[PDB]
Amino acid sequence: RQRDIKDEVWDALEEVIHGKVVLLNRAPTLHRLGIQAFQPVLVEGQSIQLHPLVCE
Amino acid sequence: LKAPVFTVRTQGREYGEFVLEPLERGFGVTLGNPLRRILLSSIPGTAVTSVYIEDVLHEFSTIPGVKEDVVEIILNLKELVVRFLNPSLQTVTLLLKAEGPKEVKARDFLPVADVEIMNPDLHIATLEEGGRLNMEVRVDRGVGYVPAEKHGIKDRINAIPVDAVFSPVRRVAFQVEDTRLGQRTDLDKLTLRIWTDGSVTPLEALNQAVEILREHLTYFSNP
Amino acid sequence: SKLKAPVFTVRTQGREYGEFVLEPLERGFGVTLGNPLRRILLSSIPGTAVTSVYIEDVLHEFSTIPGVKEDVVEIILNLKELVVRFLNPSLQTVTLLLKAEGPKEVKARDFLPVADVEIMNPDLHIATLEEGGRLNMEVRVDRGVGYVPAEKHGIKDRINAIPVDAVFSPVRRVAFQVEDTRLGQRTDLDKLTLRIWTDGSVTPLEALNQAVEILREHLTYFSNPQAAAVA
Amino acid sequence: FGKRKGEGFGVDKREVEVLRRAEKLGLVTPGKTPEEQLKELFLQGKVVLYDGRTGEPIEGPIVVGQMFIMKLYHMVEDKMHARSTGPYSLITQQPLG
Amino acid sequence: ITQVRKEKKGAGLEFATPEEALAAHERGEVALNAPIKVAGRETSVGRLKYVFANPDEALLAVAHGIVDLQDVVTVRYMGKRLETSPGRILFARIVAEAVEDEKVAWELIQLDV
Amino acid sequence: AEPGIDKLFGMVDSKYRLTVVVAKRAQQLLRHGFKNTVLEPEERPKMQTLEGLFDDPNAVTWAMKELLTGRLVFGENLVPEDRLQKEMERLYPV
Amino acid sequence: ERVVRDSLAALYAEEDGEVAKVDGNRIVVRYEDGRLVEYPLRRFYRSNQGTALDQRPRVVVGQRVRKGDLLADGPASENGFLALGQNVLVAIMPFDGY
Amino acid sequence: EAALRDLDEEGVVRIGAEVKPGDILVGRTSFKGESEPTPEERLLRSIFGEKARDVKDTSLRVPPGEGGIVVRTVRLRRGDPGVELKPGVREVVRVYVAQKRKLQVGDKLANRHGNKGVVAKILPVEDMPHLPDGTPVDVILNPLGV
RNA sequence: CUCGA
DNA sequence: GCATCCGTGAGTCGAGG
Ligand SMILES: [Mg+2]
Ligand SMILES: [Mg+2]
C-alpha cells in the first residue's frame, strides 16, 4: 500500500542501489550501444533521465 | 528548514573551495551570483598604474641591452603582487636601478616603509653586458580592473599608463547542485571557488564580499 | 574615492504597487542588488491562500450544484484568486463562511465578516446563482509560503472537504531598472529602481523589507566556517 | 515601450549592451536612438531578455511571442511501469506482457 | 565562444606608429577587430590596445566588459605572446582543467580555429 | 568511468579476464563477509548514510579497488578449487 | 468554429428565443413559438479514451438568443471555437541543455 | 478497519473517497480451492489456535500508479428489475475514478507545425527568462529544432 | 487492427 | 538447355482494445 510507505524505506533504497548499475535500452536495438549501463540516481517524477552525450 | 553548514577547504593563501548546504530551492544562485560579482569588482587591492623608464619614449619602443621589449616588462609588472601594510597608505612609487649581466627580480626594488612584495622571485627583465635599466613604477590602491587609457595617469611626459589590475581575486567560479534533506527534494548546494594572488586570502576575500553586500542591504532604510 | 551611502527613495500607489530607488551605486551593483531581491521577492515572501473548500451537498470537486451555473472545479478556480489579508500576525488560519441563495451573482464580498480579516478583492466573482440555487461554503485560508499543490498538503477540515492548490505568494510581479547616473566626476554609476506589484495582502514595501531581511539572514550563514573532513 | 516612457523610465544599461551586440550582428542600424533600435528589433520579432538567475541580459535579442501549444494524450503517468516478479504464461512459463 | 569577430570599419588602413592606429580607433575611424597594417605587418587595433599578462587578466577584463570573448586580442600564455580571443583561451583552459594536464591539453586543441 | 579502469585494463591480456577476476573476487568477499579483504582500514570504500560514513556494501567496488593494489593474484590453475574453498573457510568462517 | 459545430460538441439554439433557466446541469430556453425546450448538459462523462466529456453553459438567465447561437461549450471549446490547448508566452533560445 | 475505512456497508468504496494504489475499490470474497494444508500450516494453526476461514480476499484494488477520486458506482444484481447478467454471474460492480492531471516532466507537448517534445524541466518563476517589464516567459523552445 | 518511438 | 508453379520470407519494441 502506497499510503503505508514511509520515508525511511527511500533512504534504505538509496543504500540498496549504491554502486550498482542498471541497463538502459532503446528499441530498435541496432547495435550494441542500444543497450548501455548506468549508475542510477533516484529522482522524483516518472521519467527516466538520459545523458545527452549517449543520445547519438 | 535547519541552518546550513558552512564548509571550507584551503590550499595556502591562493585557493579555496567554499560549500554551503542545504539551501532552499534557488538560493544557491541567489547567493552565488552577487558574491561572484562583488568578489571580482569590489575587493580592495593594489596595482601598477604607471611606469617610467629612462630613455624610453613610448610603450612600443625597444630597450638597448635588455632582452625584453617594453611591452614584456610592463606585462611582468602587471603580475607584481604588492601589499600595503598600513591602511593609511594610498599610493607609492617604487624605484629600480640595475645594469650589467643580471636578471632583475621583484626583490631588486628598493624597499619602502609598509610596502610588502609578496612575490620577490618574480622575473622583471634580463640585462646584458652594458644593458642599463632605470625605472620608476607607480603603485595605487583600488578595486576591479581599470584599463590604461581610462585612468590615464602621468607624473611626467614619458610615463607609460598601465592597465590597473587592482583586484586581488583572479577568478571566481561557483556551481549549484541539487541536494536532499530527508524528503525535501529540491534543495540547493552552493560550492564557491576563489583564486587570489596571495595578498588577500580566499576566505578573507569572501568575508569582505559578504560584508560589502550586507552593508548595501542596509541602504534600504531611511527615505 | 570610495562611494558612500546612496539616497533611498520610495514611491507608492495604494497597497498594490511600489517603486524603490537607490542612487548612486557603484558600477554593476544595480544588478548585484536588484536580482537577488527579485529572486527572493518572487519565491520566498509569506502570504495567504485558500487551502480548503467545503460545499454542502457536494462530495468532490467533479460536481455540479443545482441552481448554480459554475461547476465546482470552476468555483475553486475562482476561489484560488481570493486575496485575504490577516491584520493579526499570530493568526494562522481562518474559515470564511458563505451562505447564499436566490437569483444573484455571488461575489467575494458575500463572505461573513471576521475580526482581523480583510478581503482585498471583494468584487471577485465566485458563482452565479439561479432561482432556487443555494450555495453554502466553508473556505479554509492559511498562512504559508511558496506554491503548495493540493496533492502535497491534503488539508481537509471535514470528510467531504476539497483540498485546494495554494499559491501563498502575495507578490504578483517584480522588475528592476538599472539606469546610468553620475556623482561628481565619476561616470557609469548605477541608479537602481525596484518595481514591485503585490496583491494588497502585503504592501510592496513590506515585501521589500522582508526580502532584504531574508537575504541578510542568508548572508549570516557564512559566519561559522568548518574544516573539510575529506582529507 | 510608450507605456514605459510614460511611467517615467528611460532605457536600461543592459538594453544598451544588447543594442551594442545587435549593432555588431547587423540587426539594427548604427546611429539611431535606443528606442529606434529596440523598435527595429521588435519589428524583427525580437526583444531584450534578462536571465532570471543573474539579472544579466541574454547577449543577443531573443524571439519571444505567443504560441499555441497542445498537451498530447501521451502522458508519462500512463506509461511508467516496473516489475520485479509477477504472473507468468501458461505454456512457456515466461512473464506476461 | 571560439569564433572571432571580423569587422569592416577599418578596412585595411595603413599606419606607421601604433599610437596613430589607437588614435584613429579613438576617433571612430577604425573598428577594434578590423584587419589593418601597422608598420609592415598585418594586425588590428585590438591586438595593440589590449595586451594581457595572462588568461586570468583577459577573462577579468571580459567580466568587466572591457572586451568580449570574440574580440581578437594579445594574451601571454605559457611563455608565448599569442594573438587570439579570450574565448579561445577560455576553451583551452576548459580542456586543460578537464584533463589535468596543461601541456598535453595545449598539444591537443587547435587554437587558431 | 570506474576509478582506474585504464590501469585495470592494463593488468590483463583480455578485458573479459578482468571481468571474471573482479566477479569471482566479489563473490569471495560476499561469501566471507568482507573479512578476507586485502584493504587496510583507511583504504575501505565508504558510503555516506544519514548517520555517517559506513562501509560500502558493494562487493564489486571492493573487488576492483583491491585489484588496483596488486595484493591479489590471478591466473589459471593457481590451486585446486576445493582446497581454495576449504582454506578460505578455515581462515574466514561463514 | 465549423469543427466544433459539425462535431456536435457544443449546444446551439434551435431557434430565436429567450433563455429561461441556466444551470450547470441544464439550460431551459423559451423559443418564439412559446415552447419551453430543456437541454440537459452532459457533465463529467468518460470518453473512449478516458478524457472528460462535459458541456458548460455559456449563456445567462434572460439572455436573448438567435438561431444557431451558442448555448454550451463542449470539451475543447472556447466560446464555440476549437480549443485544443493553451496560448503561452514562449522564448526561442537554448537553455542549459534542458 | 484502516483498510475498510472507505468501503460502504455493501463493500463498495464511497463516492468522494480518495483512492491510492493498493486501496480497495470493491470488497469480494471467494471460497478457497479445496485446501490440503501442508504440515507447516497445520502446526502454525495449532500454535495460534485459529481456524482457517472458508473464504479468501479477492477484492478489486487500485492498480499501481493509478487512483484519484471515486465519482460514480454502478451495481447490477441478479434477481432485480431490468437485470439479467451472463449465466453464473451473481452481480457486477463498476467504479469510476476521476483524476485531475497537472502537466508533469515527461508529458508530451506539441504545436500545429509538427514541433513536439516532452517536458524535461519545470523551472520556478524566478529562474525563467523575463522581459524588462518583469514578465517571465512560459515556455522555452530550442532554435535547433527549426 | 489503430497509435507511439 | 530454358520458361513454369510452388513455397517462403518481408524491423523493433511499446500502447489501445
Ligand atoms: Mg534545487
Ligand atoms: Mg593597452
Side-chain angles (χ1 to χ4, degrees):
Chain A
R1 300 177 86 249
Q2 186 170 98
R3 59 177 67 234
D4 292 338
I5 303 176
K6 62 191 58 181
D7 287 302
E8 301 89 72
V9 328
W10 298 116
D11 291 317
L13 185 55
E14 291 278 356
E15 299 175 26
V16 160
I17 66 170
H18 193 263
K20 282 180 174 170
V21 295
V22 293
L23 303 186
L24 283 193
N25 166 240
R26 182 188 172 269
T29 310
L30 301 178
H31 56 186
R32 78 187 187 182
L33 294 135
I35 300 188
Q36 291 180 49
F38 299 91
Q39 196 176 84
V41 175
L42 299 190
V43 302
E44 308 290 324
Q46 305 180 253
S47 298
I48 288 154
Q49 277 172 19
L50 185 78
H51 199 277
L53 306 179
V54 308
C55 288
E56 177 181 349
Chain B
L1 183 58
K2 206 122 168 295
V5 46
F6 181 46
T7 308
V8 189
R9 210 177 323 180
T10 76
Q11 301 180 11
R13 296 178 47 88
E14 297 274 341
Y15 178 72
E17 308 190 21
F18 305 88
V19 176
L20 195 68
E21 59 173 332
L23 293 166
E24 191 56 80
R25 187 184 72 179
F27 279 84
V29 326
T30 294
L31 299 179
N33 278 316
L35 291 186
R36 175 181 178 274
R37 293 171 65 84
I38 296 175
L39 282 163
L40 288 182
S41 67
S42 308
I43 310 298
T46 58
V48 172
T49 55
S50 204
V51 171
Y52 170 71
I53 308 177
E54 275 201 16
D55 302 328
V56 172
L57 292 185
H58 55 96
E59 191 172 26
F60 305 110
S61 303
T62 184
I63 300 181
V66 176
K67 102 146 78 89
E68 296 85 356
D69 54 16
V70 184
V71 175
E72 192 67 31
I73 303 176
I74 291 178
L75 291 175
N76 295 329
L77 293 171
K78 280 183 174 184
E79 299 197 4
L80 186 61
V81 183
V82 170
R83 188 179 180 190
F84 293 173
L85 293 321
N86 192 31
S88 310
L89 180 50
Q90 287 275 57
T91 166
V92 205
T93 292
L94 271 48
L95 300 101
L96 184 138
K97 297 166 186 172
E99 61 174 354
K102 186 184 181 179
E103 294 190 8
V104 176
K105 295 296 177 292
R107 208 183 333 272
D108 298 16
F109 280 106
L110 292 167
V112 178
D114 296 335
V115 172
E116 177 187 6
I117 292 189
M118 306 285 299
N119 53 342
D121 297 35
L122 170 63
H123 180 69
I124 278 76
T126 70
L127 284 73
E128 301 142 0
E129 291 280 359
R132 300 167 63 91
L133 182 62
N134 193 319
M135 66 164 50
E136 304 163 2
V137 293
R138 168 87 172 278
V139 174
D140 276 273
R141 174 134 61 182
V143 296
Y145 183 89
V146 183
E149 47 278 332
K150 285 300 171 59
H151 62 82
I153 75 179
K154 280 189 176 65
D155 295 334
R156 52 187 84 193
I157 199 64
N158 291 330
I160 311 172
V162 177
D163 302 321
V165 194
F166 293 113
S167 184
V169 172
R170 303 205 168 282
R171 168 156 75 125
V172 177
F174 77 103
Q175 200 191 30
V176 183
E177 304 166 21
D178 284 270
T179 184
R180 67 185 198 93
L181 179 74
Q183 223 57 35
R184 292 289 218 102
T185 63
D186 45 339
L187 306 183
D188 279 18
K189 174 194 176 185
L190 173 59
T191 294
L192 187 57
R193 300 156 69 198
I194 300 175
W195 288 259
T196 69
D197 54 19
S199 64
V200 186
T201 77
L203 178 54
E204 285 166 9
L206 179 57
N207 290 327
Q208 293 184 37
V210 301
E211 172 63 29
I212 288 176
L213 182 55
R214 181 206 66 83
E215 180 174 350
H216 278 73
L217 286 174
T218 67
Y219 295 161
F220 298 91
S221 297
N222 188 257
Chain C
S1 183
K2 164 66 181 304
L3 220 295
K4 306 220 179 183
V7 63
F8 173 53
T9 304
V10 166
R11 296 191 289 270
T12 71
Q13 301 188 26
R15 296 178 56 88
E16 318 277 56
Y17 177 68
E19 304 183 358
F20 306 92
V21 194
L22 218 69
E23 65 167 332
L25 300 165
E26 279 291 343
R27 177 181 55 102
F29 270 87
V31 164
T32 297
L33 286 178
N35 202 67
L37 290 183
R38 177 173 186 272
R39 295 183 51 80
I40 294 174
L41 283 168
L42 290 173
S43 66
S44 299
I45 309 302
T48 55
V50 171
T51 62
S52 197
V53 171
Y54 171 72
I55 306 179
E56 182 173 346
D57 301 339
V58 164
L59 300 171
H60 54 66
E61 190 168 0
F62 308 95
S63 311
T64 57
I65 309 171
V68 180
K69 173 177 178 168
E70 293 83 0
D71 55 85
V72 174
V73 176
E74 184 166 357
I75 293 179
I76 294 172
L77 281 177
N78 291 339
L79 292 180
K80 288 179 61 180
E81 303 200 302
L82 187 67
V83 186
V84 178
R85 174 191 176 185
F86 293 171
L87 272 297
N88 193 316
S90 305
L91 191 47
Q92 299 286 358
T93 173
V94 178
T95 297
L96 276 62
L97 305 183
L98 189 137
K99 207 156 300 181
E101 52 188 12
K104 66 170 298 184
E105 291 199 343
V106 177
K107 308 302 180 191
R109 222 189 330 267
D110 299 280
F111 282 116
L112 299 189
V114 175
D116 295 332
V117 170
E118 177 194 359
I119 289 83
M120 306 303 302
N121 58 335
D123 281 24
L124 167 63
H125 178 87
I126 295 185
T128 298
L129 266 59
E130 200 190 24
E131 241 302 321
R134 272 150 57 243
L135 182 61
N136 188 25
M137 307 189 310
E138 304 176 2
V139 325
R140 169 171 177 168
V141 182
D142 278 277
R143 283 193 185 276
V145 67
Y147 169 60
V148 179
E151 317 84 62
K152 189 52 199 175
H153 67 69
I155 295 167
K156 300 177 63 169
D157 281 8
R158 56 179 70 188
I159 309 295
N160 286 326
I162 303 165
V164 175
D165 293 327
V167 185
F168 292 109
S169 177
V171 177
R172 293 203 171 277
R173 173 146 55 105
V174 180
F176 72 87
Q177 199 90 4
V178 179
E179 287 168 307
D180 200 26
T181 192
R182 59 169 300 132
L183 176 65
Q185 289 290 287
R186 324 175 201 238
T187 53
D188 202 18
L189 291 177
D190 289 346
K191 175 186 173 188
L192 171 65
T193 307
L194 270 166
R195 305 223 290 165
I196 308 171
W197 289 260
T198 70
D199 55 6
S201 168
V202 335
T203 78
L205 181 52
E206 295 170 6
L208 175 61
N209 288 329
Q210 43 193 309
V212 165
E213 169 59 30
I214 284 162
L215 185 50
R216 203 270 314 169
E217 180 179 350
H218 273 89
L219 287 178
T220 292
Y221 296 152
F222 292 86
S223 60
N224 181 26
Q226 209 88 6
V230 187
Chain D
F1 196 78
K3 176 183 302 179
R4 156 194 264 197
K5 302 314 286 282
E7 292 168 351
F9 296 98
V11 298
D12 194 292
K13 285 187 160 191
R14 298 119 96 204
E15 287 179 320
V16 168
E17 182 182 0
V18 178
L19 284 181
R20 186 180 57 94
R21 287 260 186 179
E23 268 169 81
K24 295 182 193 302
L25 292 162
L27 255 37
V28 295
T29 74
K32 290 192 176 187
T33 62
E35 175 164 0
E36 292 168 323
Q37 297 190 319
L38 286 173
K39 183 158 182 146
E40 293 183 308
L41 291 180
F42 199 91
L43 261 55
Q44 295 162 66
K46 298 176 178 178
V47 298
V48 172
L49 220 50
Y50 298 151
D51 190 347
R53 298 113 87 213
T54 56
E56 302 164 31
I58 308 302
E59 296 177 358
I62 299 301
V63 173
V64 168
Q66 278 181 309
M67 185 187 286
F68 180 75
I69 299 180
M70 310 166 285
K71 190 226 267 181
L72 306 188
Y73 186 59
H74 305 279
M75 284 157 289
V76 64
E77 182 173 342
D78 298 315
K79 301 193 168 185
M80 196 202 70
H81 172 55
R83 162 191 174 122
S84 50
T85 59
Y88 302 95
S89 191
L90 270 174
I91 304 181
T92 63
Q93 288 299 326
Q94 294 171 352
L96 293 187
Chain E
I1 68 158
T2 60
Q3 176 66 285
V4 299
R5 285 170 178 160
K6 191 75 170 184
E7 287 158 349
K8 305 172 182 176
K9 201 186 204 69
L13 289 182
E14 287 278 4
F15 291 88
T17 57
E19 20 274 325
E20 289 176 329
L22 269 56
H25 167 67
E26 184 54 39
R27 298 196 288 273
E29 302 175 358
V30 177
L32 189 66
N33 302 295
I36 61 181
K37 293 180 184 178
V38 179
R41 183 175 297 176
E42 64 171 22
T43 177
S44 61
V45 171
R47 315 185 199 208
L48 309 169
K49 183 153 153 54
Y50 307 101
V51 183
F52 303 101
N54 50 80
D56 278 328
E57 184 190 347
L59 294 175
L60 181 65
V62 169
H64 282 269
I66 308 304
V67 288
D68 293 338
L69 288 173
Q70 299 79 10
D71 287 318
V72 185
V73 112
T74 302
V75 185
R76 183 172 64 179
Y77 190 19
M78 296 166 65
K80 308 177 181 182
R81 182 173 298 184
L82 307 174
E83 288 179 7
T84 187
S85 69
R88 301 181 166 180
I89 289 295
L90 177 56
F91 175 75
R93 186 226 263 159
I94 289 164
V95 177
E97 291 186 347
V99 303
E100 281 188 279
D101 202 319
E102 218 158 299
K103 313 85 95 82
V104 174
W106 185 253
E107 297 170 2
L108 294 184
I109 76 171
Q110 316 169 34
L111 191 77
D112 302 333
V113 76
Chain F
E2 299 287 0
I5 186 63
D6 292 284
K7 182 179 178 182
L8 289 176
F9 280 146
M11 288 186 180
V12 285
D13 58 346
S14 175
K15 59 191 295 187
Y16 305 114
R17 175 161 273 135
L18 167 66
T19 309
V20 169
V21 167
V22 167
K24 282 179 179 181
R25 179 54 180 176
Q27 297 170 0
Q28 288 180 359
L29 294 166
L30 290 168
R31 187 155 57 251
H32 300 287
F34 293 80
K35 289 177 169 60
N36 51 344
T37 187
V38 299
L39 294 180
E40 299 282 60
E42 67 280 9
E43 297 173 331
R44 284 173 163 253
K46 298 293 179 180
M47 172 188 60
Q48 239 300 140
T49 342
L50 314 176
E51 310 169 342
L53 277 73
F54 206 88
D55 279 340
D56 195 324
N58 199 304
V60 169
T61 304
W62 279 73
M64 298 180 86
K65 196 173 185 187
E66 290 184 321
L67 212 44
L68 285 176
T69 65
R71 297 164 209 168
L72 293 185
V73 179
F74 63 88
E76 312 193 31
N77 305 316
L78 302 190
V79 51
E81 203 67 57
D82 53 342
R83 195 45 160 240
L84 175 67
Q85 288 180 339
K86 290 299 170 296
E87 289 295 332
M88 280 200 124
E89 287 183 29
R90 178 179 293 104
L91 286 170
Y92 331 89
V94 189
Chain G
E1 270 170 317
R2 269 305 295 273
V3 173
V4 172
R5 183 175 297 274
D6 281 42
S7 65
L8 292 164
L11 217 318
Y12 302 95
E14 179 173 343
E15 214 75 41
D16 306 84
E18 177 184 350
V19 186
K21 292 186 175 182
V22 174
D23 198 29
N25 293 321
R26 133 244 90 184
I27 300 183
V28 185
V29 174
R30 175 178 293 278
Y31 292 117
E32 297 288 71
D33 346 339
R35 58 184 174 111
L36 237 58
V37 177
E38 189 186 53
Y39 300 106
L41 298 187
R42 178 178 295 104
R43 278 300 192 152
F44 302 105
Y45 273 53
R46 170 177 199 280
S47 77
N48 273 9
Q49 285 70 30
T51 57
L53 260 50
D54 70 318
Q55 298 162 304
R56 283 77 47 83
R58 290 288 175 259
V59 292
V60 79
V61 177
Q63 178 170 341
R64 197 66 193 181
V65 298
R66 299 194 191 94
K67 186 184 185 62
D69 270 25
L70 178 71
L71 289 181
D73 264 329
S77 192
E78 182 193 26
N79 305 319
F81 291 95
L82 185 64
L84 291 188
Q86 222 80 77
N87 297 310
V88 299
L89 194 63
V90 314
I92 305 189
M93 56 174 299
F95 200 86
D96 276 14
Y98 285 109
Chain H
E1 164 60 26
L4 303 167
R5 181 173 55 96
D6 291 328
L7 299 190
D8 74 348
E9 296 179 344
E10 303 185 356
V12 177
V13 66
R14 64 173 183 87
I15 307 287
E18 180 196 4
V19 296
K20 298 181 178 181
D23 293 335
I24 306 179
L25 301 173
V26 181
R28 194 187 63 176
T29 64
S30 297
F31 283 94
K32 302 182 175 181
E34 346 142 341
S35 294
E36 175 83 42
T38 52
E40 285 78 9
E41 258 75 10
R42 311 192 59 80
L43 178 56
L44 194 64
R45 215 91 248 179
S46 298
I47 295 181
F48 289 96
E50 274 279 47
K51 263 289 185 180
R53 294 201 58 182
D54 283 313
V55 294
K56 68 179 179 179
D57 190 346
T58 53
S59 307
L60 172 58
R61 298 174 188 269
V62 177
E66 294 172 28
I69 312 298
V70 178
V71 298
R72 289 194 60 224
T73 60
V74 176
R75 184 155 177 172
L76 309 179
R77 314 116 266 91
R78 184 174 70 196
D80 288 30
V83 185
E84 175 176 288
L85 297 328
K86 25 188 302 299
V89 180
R90 307 182 57 88
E91 35 193 356
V92 176
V93 179
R94 278 190 278 272
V95 179
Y96 291 88
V97 182
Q99 56 191 192
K100 216 164 60 167
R101 298 185 178 187
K102 283 244 185 62
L103 191 56
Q104 53 169 340
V105 173
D107 284 344
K108 192 169 176 172
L109 297 179
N111 63 21
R112 301 167 284 180
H113 311 273
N115 193 333
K116 47 170 178 172
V118 302
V119 175
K121 187 73 165 185
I122 305 181
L123 290 179
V125 64
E126 68 275 7
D127 279 10
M128 297 297 295
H130 56 104
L131 300 177
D133 62 14
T135 302
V137 303
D138 296 316
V139 173
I140 314 177
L141 301 175
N142 200 317
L144 291 169
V146 181

